[PDB]
Amino acid sequence: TLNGGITDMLTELANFEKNVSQAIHKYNAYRKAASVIAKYPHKIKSGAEAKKLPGVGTKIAEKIDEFLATGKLRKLEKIRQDDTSSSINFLTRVSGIGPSAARKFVDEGIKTLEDLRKNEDKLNHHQRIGLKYFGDFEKRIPREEMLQMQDIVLNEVKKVDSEYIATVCGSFRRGAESSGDMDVLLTHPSFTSESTKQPKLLHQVVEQLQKVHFITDTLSKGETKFMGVCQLPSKNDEKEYPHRRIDIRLIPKDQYYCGVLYFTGSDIFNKNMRAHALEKGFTINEYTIRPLGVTGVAGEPLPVDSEKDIFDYIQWKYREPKDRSE
DNA sequence: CCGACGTCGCATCAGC
DNA sequence: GCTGATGCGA
DNA sequence: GTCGG
Ligand SMILES: Cc1cn([C@H]2C[C@H](O)[C@@H](COP(=O)(O)NP(=O)(O)OP(=O)(O)O)O2)c(=O)[nH]c1=O
Ligand SMILES: [Mn+2]
Ligand SMILES: [Mn+2]
Ligand code: NA
Ligand code: NA
Numbered sequence: 001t002l003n004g005g006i007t008d009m010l011t012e013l014a015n016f017e018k019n020v021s022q023a024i025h026k027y028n029a030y031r032k033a034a035s036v037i038a039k040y041p042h043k044i045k046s047g048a049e050a051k052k053l054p055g056v057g058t059k060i061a062e063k064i065d066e067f068l069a070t071g072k073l074r075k076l077e078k079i080r081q082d083d084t085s086s087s088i089n090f091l092t093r094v095s096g097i098g099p100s101a102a103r104k105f106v107d108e109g110i111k112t113l114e115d116l117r118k119n120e121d122k123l124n125h126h127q128r129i130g131l132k133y134f135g136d137f138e139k140r141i142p143r144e145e146m147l148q149m150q151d152i153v154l155n156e157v158k159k160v161d162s163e164y165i166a167t168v169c170g171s172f173r174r175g176a177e178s179s180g181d182m183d184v185l186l187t188h189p190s191f192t193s194e195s196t197k198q199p200k201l202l203h204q205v206v207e208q209l210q211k212v213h214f215i216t217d218t219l220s221k222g223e224t225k226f227m228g229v230c231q232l233p234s235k236n237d238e239k240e241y242p243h244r245r246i247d248i249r250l251i252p253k254d255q256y257y258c259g260v261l262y263f264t265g266s267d268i269f270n271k272n273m274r275a276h277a278l279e280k281g282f283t284i285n286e287y288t289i290r291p292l293g294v295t296g297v298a299g300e301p302l303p304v305d306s307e308k309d310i311f312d313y314i315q316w317k318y319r320e321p322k323d324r325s326e
Numbered sequence: 327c328c329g330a331c332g333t334c335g336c337a338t339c340a341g342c
Numbered sequence: 343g344c345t346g347a348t349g350c351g352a
Numbered sequence: 353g354t355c356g357g
Contacts, residue, residue: 025331029353057354098350220336274332285333
């Protein structure tokens with residue numbers, strides 16, 4: 001938290017450009033700058049010092065100078081005073097509501113948490129559940145709770161088929177002391193890049209986790225990805241645990257390492273790694289790493305037998321999951 | 327200066 | 343219904 | 353908004 005005030009300012013600017021301006025690249029420009037300043041191990045004394053970092057240009061340098069001299073940013077101060085901005089920003093915090101839906105609700109006058117509650121018939125399913133657990137969905141999850149949830153998921157998955165391998169990724173695998181949610185990568189021998197010898201592979205798992213009342217709600221559900229809600233059991237007389245977000249991703253067994261790399265994160269780490277792969281002439285997704293031909297068309301999947309091999313191709317020294325928290 | 331900015335899964339909709 | 347775009351999300 | 357070419 002050496003430069004917490006600065007990275008907060010940039011994060012807020014990033015949120016504004018995303019939710020209000022709907023300018024996704026500005027949003028990522030601020031996010032990158034916030035990220036690169038975050039891992040910077042010096043208390044930044046001036047915007048020019050910060051400009052030396054890759055991802056910090058003139059406009060941000062000027063804003064960091066204003067922030068360091070006053071403790072505030074006049075651009076952010078106005079944005080806060082704007083009703084439309086403050087309204088749209090708030091609505092996007094509800095899962096299922098993006099910038100588009102948030103702005104549309106404001107046109108109708110639906111702009112508060114109470115407006116949403118009286119207008120439930122105007123929300124889709126995802127948004128309704130997002131409103132339902134709006135309170136719970138902003139609480140963090142302590143690692144102690146993540147360990148409990150992990151115990152249940154891995155065992156419930158073992159109870160359906162002993163060949164299911166489940167791996168908790170995301171910030172948990174990065175060794176975070178707390179997580180925003182739980183992320184589960186899933187592999188079964190029947191599902192490979194060649195064939196899907198058994199249908200409902202993800203469905204059976206989800207079905208099981210619902211049966212024991214772990215999974216309580218579903219935001220979206222397909223053949224390879226589940227997006228929903230989970231909750232820890234509470235002993236007698238204790239206040240219930242908050243409902244938590246859970247993502248489950250079924251990825252082909254032979255493509256485990258590309259999947260586990262992607263799911264481990266962080267989102268910005270994946271961004272910078274895949275952006276570096278392009279400069280190196282490769283393309284990385286959750287499945288394979290493919291070379292780029294003379295044209296720029298993805299070639300055939302190069303062989304991968306560890307997470308490190310992916311780093312080897314793009315000429316990166318291996319970085320442990322805890323060193324990827326960007 | 328200026329094109330390019332990771333990559334993909336699911337829900338929802340317009341168009342046929 | 344299918345296909346492709348869009349919205350929102352991982 | 354930033355940056356490599
Ligand atoms: C949202 C997002 C997800 N991911 C794939 C990798 C992110 O690290 C990851 C897990 O998603 P998450 O739980 O939404 N993000 P996190 O696990 O790094 O942070 P947290 O635990 O929710 O706070 O999933 C991306 O590659 N880019 C993204 O923008
Ligand atoms: Mn997570
Ligand atoms: Mn997640
Ligand atoms: Na810079
Ligand atoms: Na949202």
